[PDB]
Amino acid sequence: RSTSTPNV
Amino acid sequence: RSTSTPNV
Amino acid sequence: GAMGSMERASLIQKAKLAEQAERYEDMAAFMKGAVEKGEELSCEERNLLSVAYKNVVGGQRAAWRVLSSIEQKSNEEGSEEKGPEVREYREKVETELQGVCDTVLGLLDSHLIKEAGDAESRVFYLKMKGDYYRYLAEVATGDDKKRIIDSARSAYQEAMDISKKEMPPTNPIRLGLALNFSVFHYEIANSPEEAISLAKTTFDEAMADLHTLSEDSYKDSTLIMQLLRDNLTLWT
Amino acid sequence: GAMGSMERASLIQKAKLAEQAERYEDMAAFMKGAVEKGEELSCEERNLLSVAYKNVVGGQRAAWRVLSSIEQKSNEEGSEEKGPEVREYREKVETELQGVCDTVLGLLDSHLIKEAGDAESRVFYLKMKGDYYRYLAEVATGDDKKRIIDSARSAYQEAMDISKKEMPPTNPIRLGLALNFSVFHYEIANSPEEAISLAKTTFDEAMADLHTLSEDSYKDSTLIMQLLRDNLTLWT
Ligand SMILES: *SCCNC(=O)C1CCN(C(=O)C(C)(C)Oc2ccc(Cl)cc2)CC1
Ligand SMILES: *SCCNC(=O)C1CCN(C(=O)C(C)(C)Oc2ccc(Cl)cc2)CC1
Ligand SMILES: [Cl-]
Ligand SMILES: [Cl-]
Ligand SMILES: [Mg+2]
Ligand SMILES: [Mg+2]
Ligand SMILES: [Mg+2]
Ligand SMILES: [Mg+2]
Ligand SMILES: [Mg+2]
Ligand SMILES: [Mg+2]
């Protein structure tokens, strides 16, 4: 699965 | 901290 | 509702405590309460709202994926009929996930987006709107899926247009938006070539603007650029 | 309540799905529903009940520890008054933790323990009773703490007496009971020498009975023995 923006 | 019984 | 009696500042303080305690459902409830006070959110407060709901929905997404895979295997050729329980429980988790997404979208519509005039705030919220429609799309089927996909696309596109006019190509919100929109194209919209093109153009335009950044800004921008590169490697 | 309309077998099936999905609050609710059907639990079902509540209370304990440490630091000499929020939120988490412990103890009292006649079942439940009183003791203060500590001690002691009469020294339930009672002595009852003695005697009596075990039984017994040894190393 593609990686999306991580949390802080 | 002391170790207690772990879950399965 | 339940947070109406608590001071805004106390809600924010408790959100930060909940984050330290890894109590993300509490964190989300505190931040919902803070949003419902009706004042605009600061950068730090927007981050707290995002962290809280991302962790809640992230656990739900992970659980839904596990259950959907079990369900798909239950429905194969030469699998034993195990009854309605897997579907029921997958539906239960799905409905909770949809409820969280609907809650976030409701906060954005009432009235975070409309009161956000600065590019940094408006883009942040439009990105979030695209993200939560994307999470709804992950569990949607059929024609319902079509309208939800269009809603995600429309939010991301508005955010893209603003970000290109008003932010430098290294701005981390702009970069994370482009990263997430590229994920939308690849994973949701069945547009892998659009995903690849967006990721490449975003990466290259950021690379060219890194020379303008301080060390701390450079660290944030390059971290997201690495995620663009990671996806490009996965996709090509 | 909410699980009264669902078949026992469906509750058990969904508990197993919830475990795979790491949805431990759901798992606990399903297993509570199964217990409330009124039938005794099998070994596998006892394990599901334990896994569910151990993970729920474990997250609460971890959160409570984080918040208690922040609170203690807030209350030191030359610390800034930050208001009532840390205490309030620590109290909120504490109250939820106490509620989970009270729920488990209620299931054990109504009527799991009284209907458990075999040693393996009765010891399992008495150990659990000691454990959940121990978790209450971790957050208790004063004279309330004294009575809760006594309740934990009494449950563990009854379980010890049965286990010594009715189970071999390598039985994993007997071993885990002794491990947990040793933790009680060290961490709760301020009896480190009792803790050390119990852990040593338990380890040595198990070591002497390992020759009777199959490979699979040997793996389980030696795993708990290693935890006894780990604690002995920490304590000496
Ligand atoms: S000013 C708005 C609030 N701040 C942020 O969202 C930033 C928080 C920390 N951070 C990141 O963790 C990384 C580098 C992964 O980038 C992003 C995170 C979240 C978003 Cl929405 C966009 C980028 C920097 C952003
Ligand atoms: S027959 C009662 C149900 N089964 C168990 O409790 C066993 C489950 C798996 N397991 C373990 O994970 C280890 C080896 C850690 O030991 C124990 C776990 C839990 C307890 Cl209550 C006691 C030992 C074996 C026990
Ligand atoms: Cl269900
Ligand atoms: Cl609170
Ligand atoms: Mg006020
Ligand atoms: Mg068959
Ligand atoms: Mg559905
Ligand atoms: Mg029935
Ligand atoms: Mg000062
Ligand atoms: Mg209290």
Distance CA C179, CA C176 (A): 5
Q: D187 with D210: CB under 8 angstroms?
A: no
CA terminus-to-terminus distance, chain D: 49
Best C179, C230, C235 member to test A by mutation, with max A CBs in 10 Å, is C179
Nearest-CA neighbor of C51 among C103, C157, C128?
A: C128
Structural tokens at position C136: 């709804």
Distance CA D106, CA D189 (A): 24
- Quick check: D50 contacting B, CB < 8 Å? yes
Distance CA C122, CA C116 (A): 5
Q: How many residues are listed for chain A in this entry?
A: 8
Best C227, C228, C229 member to test A by mutation, with max A CBs in 10 Å, is C227
Dihedral, CA atoms, C179, C181, C186, C190, nearest 10 degrees? -170
- Determine phi and psi for C96, rounding to 5 degrees: -65, -45
Looking at CA atoms only, how far is residue C5 from chain A in angstroms? Answer: 29
Task: Provide DSSP, D172-229.
Answer: HHHHHHHHHHHHIIIIISS-HHHHHHHHHHHHHHHHTTGGG--HHHHHHHHHHHHHHH
Supply the residue whose CA is at minimum distance from atom 10 of ligand 1: A8
The helix (H) or strand (E) run that includes residue C53 is: helix C43-74
Structural tokens at position C21: 């305690």
Q: Between the CA of residue D118 and those of D41, D44, D142, what are the distances in Å?
A: 12, 15, 37
Radius of gyration (Cα) for chain B, nearest Å?
A: 7
Q: Between the CA of residue C15 and those of C21, C44, D87, what are the distances in Å?
A: 10, 11, 14
Q: Do C187 and A5 touch (CB under 8 A)?
A: no
Nearest-CA neighbor of D184 among D167, D160, D207, D209?
A: D160
Q: D152 with D183: CB under 8 angstroms?
A: no
Distance CA D123, CA D20 (A): 27
Distance CA C199, CA C227 (A): 9
Structural tokens at position C74: 């239950």
Q: Interhelix angle for C119-139 vs C85-107, to 10°? A: 160
Q: Between the CA of residue C66 and those of C9, C71, C93, C130, D201, what are the distances in Å?
A: 38, 9, 11, 24, 44
Nearest-CA neighbor of C141 among C94, C204, C81?
A: C94
Distance CA D100, CA D128 (A): 13
Instruction: Name which CATH class applies to D8-235.
Output: mainly alpha
CA atoms within 13 A on the CB side of D23: 31
Q: Is A4 helix (H, G, I), strand (E, B) or coil?
A: coil
Chains B and D contact (Cβ–Cβ under 8 Å for 3 or more pairs): yes
Q: D6 with D32: CB under 8 angstroms?
A: no
Final resolution, Å = 1.5
Distance CA D130, CA D158 (A): 10
Structural tokens at position C229: 């590169």
Residues of chain D contacting residue C92, judged by C-beta atoms under 8 Å apart: 26
Residues with C-beta atoms within 5 A of ion ligand 5: C 7
Looking at CA atoms only, how far is residue C140 from chain A in angstroms? Answer: 18
Cβ-Cβ contacts under 8 Å for A6 (sequence gap 6 or more)? C227
CA D126 vs. chain centroid, Å, equals 10
Query: Residues 105 to 144 of C: which have CB under 8 A from any D CB?
Result: none
Which single residue is written with the structure tokens 């935890």? Answer: D227
Distance CA C107, CA C111 (A): 6
Residue D27 CB-density burial (10 A; 0-12 exposed, 13-18 middle, 19+ buried): buried
Structural tokens at position C102: 């609907």
Handedness of CA C46, C52, C55, C59 (dihedral sign): negative
CA C64 vs. chain centroid, Å, equals 16
Structural tokens at position D170: 């390598």
Q: Interhelix angle for D172-183 vs D192-207, to 10°? A: 160
Distance CA C192, CA C198 (A): 10
Nearest-CA neighbor of C236 among C190, C186, C189?
A: C186
Domain locations along chain C: 8-235
CA atoms within 13 A on the CB side of C218: 8
Q: Do C51 and A1 touch (CB under 8 A)?
A: no
Cβ-Cβ contacts under 8 Å for C139 (sequence gap 6 or more)? C64, C94, C97, C98
Question: Which DSSP state fits C65?
Answer: H
Experiment type: X-ray
Cβ-Cβ contacts under 8 Å for D226 (sequence gap 6 or more)? none
Q: Which residue of D has its CA nearest to C62?
A: D21
Q: Which amino acid is at D46?
A: R
